[PDB]
């Protein structure tokens with residue numbers, strides 16, 4: 001259902017994924033301890049993504065399958081979409097300076113939303129305990 005708050009607690013491979021994006025020390029560290037409180041809010045076709053992380057309290061929002069352009073803090077351009085496979089939400093995010101591709105598997109269990117993250121061959125699970 002998604003509809004609700006999320007607050008990452010434990011991760012799983014997320015440290016190495018930042019080494020992939022080209023993040024060194026403080027950046028991947030700040031990305032981890034961020035406290036990404038996601039306040040998911042589905043209206044109908046759009047999915048707001050409140051993100052009270054260390055970077056900024058920015059609602060994201062991304063109509064399912066609507067290719068958009070989202071600048072990151074240290075990741076830069078990331079254009080791509082999210083689509084409900086039926087059982088998982090997949091955050092496909094390419095880049096403008098090259099057009100490769102990054103993906104993101106939102107594996108909701110029940111009480112936890114895990115968002116993996118691959119920019120090729122380095123996953124990064126960001127376990128959320130909802131709330």
Ligand SMILES: CCCCCCCCCCCCCCCC(=O)O
Nearest residue numbers: 027031049053060072073074075115
């Ligand atoms: C330099 C590190 C910053 C990147 C990682 C922490 C902040 C997240 C960046 C934007 C992600 C939000 C847009 C997609 C929604 C999501 O991540 O679930």
